[PDB]
Structures are given as structure tokens and as C-alpha cells.
């Protein structure tokens, strides 16, 4: 009906699949752009059975992108780091088509316009800033989403629940606060804000009060849930910093991000601005899965671990 | 004709594919065991077009393995680290069938019975030793292959030829010697020795005199080949050792191996034993691609990088 038509790039991705499912769950006509050679064949079939329209092609196909843009209203990009500046191909098509009502570039992490990181990570988020500056320069309607930490991803990474080991690695002192959100919710809320007038040309941050914690607190709560105690092994901050300078790329990128997230506490090191919008306060009919609920999920039916591409 | 029939486990793997191709090139009837859900569909079609017989199944299918064992003469395992002890399923089937003429377990690296490493790596090669002990206890005919370093893999890992950076990382002093061999050759030679009476119940080491070098010498030669100088950044040994103790698994495994190969120089830290067989001395009609030739290949048509499973 009146539902805005949504085009998602990187829909088969780690976080992208949750945006595709959330879009369909909310009854939005959904277009998924995917490479002809993608190995996400079975995932694409699932999307198709849920009602999505699959469009195979390459970002280099300018004409195809323009013709596709003319058929939709909202464009969301969930592409990976290696393709951040490739989003300029998406942006060029949006500019030519001229009918797009909202563009959400691939952020879904830290709020890059208010935080700085070590060189390895700073270079990547500087690219995301370049995208933002171009959007604003062209007066393209947007929404910048800071989803903070992907919860299943980091519960898997930090707690290694699928590992029977007796020790646990802590980065830095482990006292830095951070916020983490369940991927399924990140996906749903992203679709909601992409069409909410309250998020037009604004930064939206996902920071529900029930999802703020520190590494030590997460370990403690997990220990209580499963009835086991771990020996905590800390990796000194100076140690982490040194590695970012000596290790090659892309090996040093994760290290620099670990420093930014769990040592500097970038997802919780700032206060909200006047124009900022915190997503959990937007829909009284929805809520973010809490940390206790998340841990329960890992006790009853834990999701597989993942590793971002660099 | 009268060629021995070869069954390869993990044939679709990084080194495994080179063994399958080498087996077919040498005219051996070749059986490839692969999981029903493998994503190596296009590689499998290639094997098939080359003459290989594909057999889909799981290692847990004891009866299937036994009936398969009965149809072949030689069994080679190129499975990954996570499945080392899973090789006991292959061994049980071999014991029951009773007709196998030679079994080559998944080693193709350092000579585990004469070297020791840091805990992260020591645990993995200890498993490989367990397999070797069971083979000998059961009087199963074997050949243990120490292929040393996979060259394309490590030229990519150490030189990052696909990276236009001005710096290069050196592990330790960079003075430790190591031997590396081209994957295509490792595969060919493995098939040759699997049927050479000279390799029956012996350790075979791939160490051609033209393929021995240090990190610094490798960097130097690469610099001359491409006409560019790099800034060398060293990672102290004590630094590498500390990481193996603080970083969680699997992350700490590669670090421990880097120490073993490029700091301890495990592939060149020993002299040959009386019963050792150095493969390059075996066939006057063949030879290992040299380091110079390997570098030339990376200048004209470099192979993509890779990452072992942990
Ligand atoms: N906040 C956090 O904790 C967190 C965690 C992870 C990631 N992130 C962020 O979330 C965003 C997406 O990350 P992700 O892990 O979801 O991405 P991903 O799964 O690695 O990749 C997303 C999609 O990119 C497409 N793609 C891959 N290579 C491509 C290429 N060469 N050219 C064109 N398309 C290509 C693929 O789709 P097809 O195969 O269909 O073409 C893939 O499904 C990024 O901005 C990332 O930084 C944040
Ligand atoms: N010397 C060196 O520099 C070096 C470098 C790398 C590796 N290595 C060694 O070479 C050997 C093989 O390494 P690799 O990297 O070639 O192996 P790989 O490519 O990681 O895997 C080999 C094969 O295992 C099968 N497999 C994967 N997961 C499985 C599971 N859960 N159950 C059963 N089968 C599974 C897959 O075949 P299907 O999909 O067909 O089932 C896969 O192609 C190892 O012993 C390794 O340590 C040495
Ligand atoms: C440290 C292990 O995870 C990562 O390397 C990257 C994928 C994680 C990530 C990527 C981009 C981000 O903005 C972010 O902040 C929440 C987190
Ligand atoms: C350092 C990056 O590579 C590795 O972590 C492992 C795959 C490399 C390897 C695995 C097993 C080995 O025996 C070996 O010695 C030559 C090398």
C-alpha cells in the first residue's frame, strides 16, 4: 500500500540480513541488490520466500543502479568496510535518479563524527565521514545510525561460549562501559527509523539503558547464568596500542577497534546532543532485547560466531 | 591401467586440491571424499571434469568409509587442524577394510616428532603425534610428509604483495631460516612418494636447497624484483611469546606458529636422520619451483592470499 519501497545493498551480509527480514516483517516491499557470483544462494532463496525482490548486479553498473533507484523510496547500505568508498557509486545513482526519500549509509557502529580512534581504525571511519560529507553537500535526505556493538557478535567474541576453556581474555582493565544490541532488533529498528519523520536528517543512536555494561560485568553475569568461574587474563592497553603499530593490515584493524570499544569505551564516552535521537524511546510497542535476555538465549540456543571482513 | 587407486580426504582444501590435481595428472584413479553441504561445488565440478570420482558423505558414516576403503589402495588425508583427531574415524575404517597399502595422515608442515613449540601450537602437533602413534601401533603402512612452509601462502602472508604499503612486518630478528615450497609441487610430490617404495614407512621432508631463506633475504629479493624499498618493522620475540599466553584461542595459534617458523626456525633447526628421505633427490625428471621462480610468478600472475582454519 502506502508502505515505502526499500532497497538494501549488502542485504545478505551479517547485519544486512536482519534489515532485509525486518523490512519484510514490517510489510515493506523489499529489494535486495546482490552480486551475480555471491555464495549467499540459500539465504537469497529464504529472502525470496519471504517476499523480497532479488536484483543481481555489480555496483559498477551505473545505469542499472539508476533505473533501480527510480523504482524505490528508501536506500539502506549495509556494505562492509572494504567497500566504504564504493558507496560513492550508490550515491551517484541516487543523485541522478533524484527521487530517493532517505539514504542510510553503512555505519551501524560507533558515532564517527564525535570520536577518534587509533590510525588503523581512524582511516576506516574517516572514509565513512567522507560519505557523510558528500550526502550533506548534495542535500540528500539521510539518517545516520550508530547501532553500537552487535550483541551476538561480541558475546561470541568476548565470552567464547562455545569454548569449554577455564580462562577468559579481558582487554585493558575491562572497566570501560559499552552498549550492545541484538542484531535482530538493530535490523528492525533500522527499518522503522528509515521512514520515521523524527529521524529525518538526524543521527540516531541505539542505546537502551538495559544494554550498557562493562567486560567484567558481562563476565560476572555469564558466570552466574552457567554456574562456572573463569580466570581473567588481561591484555594491557599499552600492549594493544603497540600491536596496532607493528602488526600488518588487516590484522591490526580488529586490535585498534578492540581498543576503541573496550578500552576507550567509545560507545559510552559521550553525552547526547540536542538533535540526537535515541531509538529505544521512539516506539512504545517495541523494545530492545535486554542483556539478561540475550544471555538466556546463549544458554538455550546460542547463535554461531562471526568475523567481520577487513 | 595398473596405477594404484587413491582416496583423498579434504581434497577440496587449500593443499588438498593440489593433491587431487596431481593425482589425476599422474593418471591415478582418484576418489574424493567431501561433505554433502560443502560449498566447494565449482571446485568439485572441476575435479569431475578432470576425471575424479566424487563421494559425498560424513566421516561419521563408518560403514560407508569401510566399503569405500575396500575399493582403493592409497589413502591421503589433507584435513584441517580442527579435524586432526577426527582422523581416527578414517583410521578405524582402514583397520577394518585391511587392504590399504599406504596411509598419509594430515601433516604437511613441520616435523612434529623432532620439534617442540609453544603451548598453542604444541597441543595441535601433539594430536598429530597421537595419530602417528596409532598408525605404528596397528602396523599400518605409512609415509609421514613434512612439506615445510606453503610458499604462495607465506609469500602472501609475509610480503602482502597485494598491499601497496611502504612498510613490512618482520617477526623477531628475521634471521631465522626456513624452507618454503610451491603448493602445486607439494601436491605432485606427495602423490609420487605415496607410491614410491623408497618412502614406505618413512618420514619424507620437502627441503630443496633452492628454497631455503630468511625473512630479511626474502624481503631483499622481492625489493629487487619490483624495484621498491620497504621500511622494516620488527615484532620482538618476547612480544610474540606474551601474546600466545594472553590472547584467546584460536587467535593465539597463528602467533605461536609464527614464533615456531620464523623465530625458532623449526623447519631448518635440524639435520636429516639416517632414515629420512629428502624428496627433491627422488625424481630426476622433476624439481621444485625455486624461490626466484616463485617471486617471478607473483610479479606476473600472483595467486590470492589464504588463511588456515583454526
Ligand atoms: N557494530 C558492530 O559490532 C559491527 C560488527 C560487524 C560489522 N559492522 C558494520 O556493519 C556494516 C556491515 O558489516 P557486515 O559484517 O554485515 O558486512 P558483510 O556481512 O561482511 O558483507 C555485507 C555484504 O557485502 C557484499 N559484498 C561483499 N564483497 C563485496 C564486493 N567486493 N563488492 C560488492 N559487494 C560485496 C555481500 O553481499 P552479496 O554476496 O549479496 O553481494 C555481503 O553480504 C559495516 O559498515 C561494518 O563496519 C559493525
Ligand atoms: N605448511 C603450511 O604452510 C600449511 C598451511 C596451511 C595448512 N597446513 C596444513 O595442511 C593441512 C590441511 O590444511 P588446509 O588449509 O588445506 O585445509 P582446509 O582447506 O582448511 O580444509 C580441508 C578440507 O576439510 C574439509 N572439512 C572442513 N570442515 C570439515 C568438518 N567439520 N568435517 C569434515 N571435513 C571438513 C573440507 O572439505 P569438504 O568441504 O569437501 O568437506 C575442506 O576442504 C593441515 O594439516 C594443515 O595444518 C599447512
Ligand atoms: C574487535 C572485533 O570486531 C571488529 O573488528 C569490528 C567489526 C566490529 C566493529 C566495526 C565497526 C564499528 O563501528 C564497531 O563499533 C561498534 C565495531
Ligand atoms: C602463520 C600463519 O599460518 C598458520 O597459522 C599455520 C597454517 C600454517 C602452518 C600450519 C602447520 C604447520 O605444520 C606449518 O609449518 C610449516 C605451518
DSSP class per residue in A177-213: EEEEE-HHHHHHHHHHHHH-GGGTTEEEE---GGGEE
CA distance B187 to B148: 13
CA distance A233 to A68: 51
Residue bearing cell 594430536 = B127
- Ligand 1 atom having least distance to the Cα of A10: 23
The bound ligand whose nearest atom lies closest to the alpha carbon of A158 is 3
Q: Which helix (H) or strand (E) holds B189?
A: helix B183-193
Quick check: helix, strand or coil at residue A248?
coil
Query: Per the structure block, which three cell numbers stand in for B42?
Result: 565449482
Judge whether A202 and A143 are in contact, CB under 8 Å.
Answer: yes
Q: How far is CA A163 from the centre of its chain?
A: 25
B233/A239 touch (CB, cutoff 8 Å), yes or no: no
| Angle between the N-to-C axes of helices A237-246 and A119-137, in degrees from 0 to 180, rounded to the nearest 10 | 70
Name the pairing type of β-strands B277-278 and A74-77: unpaired
Name the pairing type of β-strands A212-214 and A177-181: antiparallel
Domain with CATH 3.90.25.10 in chain B: 147-182+206-270+284-310
Quick check: helix, strand or coil at residue B118?
coil
Q: A229-250 burial, b for 16+ CB within 10 Å, e for fewer?
A: ebeeeebebebbeebbebbbeb
Contacts of A167 in chain B (CB under 8 A): 248
Please name the residue of chain A whose CA is at the shortest distance from the CA of residue B307.
Answer: A251
| Sign of the four-CA dihedral B161, B163, B164, B170 | negative
Minimal CA separation from B150 to chain A, in Å: 20
A166 and chain B: CB distance < 8 Å anywhere? no
**CATH 3.90.25.10 correct for B147-182+206-270+284-310:** yes
Query: Distance between terminal CA atoms of chain A?
Result: 40
B63 and chain A: CB distance < 8 Å anywhere? no
Contacts of A235 in chain B (CB under 8 A): 246-247
B15 CB less than 6 Å from ligand 2? yes
Q: What is the Å distance from ligand 3's center to B286 Cα? A: 49
Please name the residue of chain A whose CA is at the shortest distance from the CA of residue B243.
Answer: A235
Query: Per the structure block, which three cell numbers stand in for B287?
Result: 624439481
Q: What angle do CA B193, B196, B197 make, to 5 degrees?
A: 135
Which of A165, A167, A248 shows the shortest C-beta gap to B169? A248
Contacts of A231 in chain B (CB under 8 A): none
Q: What angle do CA A214, A215, A217 make, to 5 degrees?
A: 65
Judge whether B258 and B250 are in contact, CB under 8 Å.
Answer: no
Q: What phi, psi does B179 have (nearest 5°)?
A: -115, 140
B182 CB less than 6 Å from ligand 2? no
Contacts of A163 in chain B (CB under 8 A): 248-249
Torsion of CA A60, A64, A70, A75, to 10 degrees: -40
CA distance B104 to B191: 10
Nearest CA to ligand 3 atom 9: A109
| Long-range contacts, A93-99 (Cβ 8 Å, 24+) | A93/A62, A93/A65, A93/A66, A93/A68, A93/A69, A94/A69, A94/A140, A95/A138, A95/A140, A96/A66, A96/A69, A97/A66, A97/A69, A97/A70, A99/A69, A99/A70, A99/A73
CA distance B187 to B191: 7
Q: Which helix (H) or strand (E) holds B237?
A: helix B237-246
CA distance A65 to A77: 13
Please name the residue of chain B whose CA is at the shortest distance from the CA of residue A232.
Answer: B246
Judge whether A99 and A68 are in contact, CB under 8 Å.
Answer: no
Look up residue A247 and give its DSSP letter.
Answer: S
By CB atoms closer than 10 A (0-12, 13-18, 19+), residue A186 is buried
Minimal CA separation from A284 to chain B, in Å: 41
B110 CB less than 6 Å from ligand 4? yes
Judge whether A184 and A25 are in contact, CB under 8 Å.
Answer: no
A246/B169 touch (CB, cutoff 8 Å), yes or no: yes
Domain with CATH 3.40.50.720 in chain A: 1-146+183-205+271-283
Strand partners, A8: A32, A76
Listed in sequence order, the residues at least 6 apart from A13 whose beta carbon sits closer than 8 Å to its beta carbon are A78, A79, A80
CA distance B162 to A261: 29
Judge whether B80 and B108 are in contact, CB under 8 Å.
Answer: no
Query: Per the structure block, which three cell numbers stand in for B148?
Result: 615445510
B257 CB less than 6 Å from ligand 2? no
A115 CB less than 6 Å from ligand 3? no
Q: Which helix (H) or strand (E) holds A253?
A: helix A252-262
Residue among B10, B188, B204, B207 nearest B106 (CA): B10
A225 and chain B: CB distance < 8 Å anywhere? no
Taking the CB of residue B243, how many other CB atoms lie within 10 A of it? 22
Choices 3.90.650.10, 3.40.50.2300, 1.20.1330.10, 3.40.50.720: CATH for B1-146+183-205+271-283: 3.40.50.720
Listed in sequence order, the residues at least 6 apart from B10 whose beta carbon sits closer than 8 Å to its beta carbon are B16, B77, B78, B79, B80, B83, B106
B247/A39 touch (CB, cutoff 8 Å), yes or no: no
CA distance A275 to A201: 10
Taking the CB of residue B169, how many other CB atoms lie within 10 A of it? 21
Residue among B34, B41, B73 nearest B57 (CA): B34
CA distance A21 to A8: 11
Taking the CB of residue B29, how many other CB atoms lie within 10 A of it? 18
Judge whether A241 and A259 are in contact, CB under 8 Å.
Answer: yes
Please name the residue of chain A whose CA is at the shortest distance from the CA of residue B167.
Answer: A248
Radius of gyration of chain B (CA): 20
CA distance A218 to A151: 11
Judge whether B128 and B281 are in contact, CB under 8 Å.
Answer: no
Query: Per the structure block, which three cell numbers stand in for B64?
Result: 560407508
Residue bearing cell 568439485 = B44
This entry's atomic model was obtained through X-ray
Listed in sequence order, the residues at least 6 apart from A188 whose beta carbon sits closer than 8 Å to its beta carbon are A18, A22, A25, A26, A286
Name the pairing type of β-strands B212-214 and B177-181: antiparallel
Q: What phi, psi does B234 have (nearest 5°)?
A: -90, 145
Listed in sequence order, the residues at least 6 apart from B228 whose beta carbon sits closer than 8 Å to its beta carbon are none
A242/B239 touch (CB, cutoff 8 Å), yes or no: yes
B90 CB less than 6 Å from ligand 2? no
A36 and chain B: CB distance < 8 Å anywhere? no
Amino acid at each position: 500500500g502506502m508502505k515505502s519501497k526499500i532497497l538494501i545493498f549488502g542485504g545478505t551480509g551479517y547485519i544486512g540480513n536482519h534489515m532485509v527480514k525486518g523490512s519484510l516483517k514490517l510489510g515493506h516491499p523489499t529489494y535486495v541488490f546482490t552480486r551475480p557470483n555471491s555464495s549467499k544462494t540459500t539465504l537469497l532463496d529464504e529472502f525470496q520466500s519471504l517476499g523480497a525482490i532479488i536484483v543481481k548486479g555489480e555496483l559498477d553498473e551505473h545505469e542499472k543502479l539508476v533505473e533501480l533507484m527510480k523504482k524505490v523510496d528508501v536506500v539502506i547500505s549495509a556494505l562492509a568496510f572494504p567497500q566504504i568508498l564504493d558507496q560513492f557509486k550508490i550515491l551517484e545513482a541516487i543523485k541522478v535518479a533524484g527521487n530517493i526519500k532517505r539514504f542510510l549509509p553503512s555505519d551501524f557502529g560507533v558515532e564517527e563524527d564525535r570520536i577518534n580512534a587509533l590510525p588503523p581504525f581512524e582511516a576506516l571511519i574517516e572514509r565513512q565521514r567522507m560519505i557523510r560529507r558528500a550526502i550533506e553537500e548534495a542535500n540528500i535526505p539521510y539518517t545516520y545510525v550508530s547501532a553500537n556493538c552487535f550483541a551476538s557478535y561480541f558475546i561470541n567474541y568476548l565470552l567464547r561460549p562455545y569454548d569449554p576453556k577455564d580462562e577468559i581474555t579481558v582487554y585493558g582493565t575491562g572497566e570501560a562501559k559499552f552498549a550492545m544490541n541484538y542484531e535482530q532488533d538493530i535490523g528492525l529498528y533500522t527499518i522503522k527509523v528509515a521512514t520515521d519523520p523524527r529521524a529525518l536528517n538526524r543521527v540516531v543512536i541505539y542505546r537502551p539503558s538495559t544494554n550498557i555494561i562493562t567486560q567484567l560485568e558481562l563476565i560476572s553475569r555469564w558466570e552466574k547464568k552457567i554456574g562456572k568461574k573463569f580466570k581473567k587474563i588481561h591484555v594491557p592497553e599499552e600492549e594493544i596500542v603497540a600491536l596496532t603499530k607493528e602488526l600488518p593490515e588487516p590484522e591490526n584493524i580488529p586490535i585498534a577497534i578492540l581498543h576503541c570499544l573496550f578500552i576507550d569505551g567509545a560507545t559510552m564516552s559521550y553525552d547526547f546532543k540536542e538533535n540526537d535521537v535515541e531509538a529505544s524511546t521512539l516506539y512504545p510497542e517495541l523494545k530492545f532485547t535486554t542483556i539478561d535476555e540475550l544471555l538466556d538465549i546463549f544458554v538455550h540456543d546460542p547463535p554461531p560466531p562471526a568475523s567481520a571482513a577487513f
